[PDB]
Symmetry: C2
């Protein structure tokens, strides 16, 4: 319950017994914060929603498409090539 | 013997029997063709060199960083998440 209250104070979920950040993601999409919406959707364990949001953002305003396509290469292997490369060059993203 | 001659006529390899495309890659990086070098390096079955070329290219003159991250997640699983979206989103690249 304390974590839910903290989330509500952070604004990720509306007050009450909400169990999703769907309204928050929609509000972020409407506002125009594509990257923040994608990050929030990924923090809620949804790669598909993050990719969809990034594709929608790339439709408006090009790099978001390749960002979402890069995000789709998530692998659980510790020695995976994607893990190493994304860890190394993540700092170069604007 | 015919295939190696054909690559020479395409310029991919230097004059001789040297089974490598490394000298060709260096000229392309010098010539400034950075996206072509990544493709030529990849076609010789070298992701890491393709990532290195894109990373080196993105460092000078920043979308190539993400392309390197996107290329680093090559998964050969038939129903993988990467192949599901990268195949669809590849058509939206400049």
């Amino acid at each position: 319950e304390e974590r839910i209250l903290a989330l509500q104070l952070c604004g990720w979920i509306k007050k009450g017994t909400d169990v999703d950040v769907g309204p928050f993601l929609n509000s972020l999409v409407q506002e125009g914060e594509w990257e923040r919406a994608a990050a929030v959707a990924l923090f809620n364990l949804d790669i598909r929603r993050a990719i969809q949001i990034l594709n929608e953002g790339a439709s408006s305003e090009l790099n978001l498409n390749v960002v979402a396509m890069a995000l789709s290469g998530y692998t659980d292997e510790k020695n995976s090539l994607w893990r190493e490369m994304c860890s190394t060059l993540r700092l170069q993203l604007n």
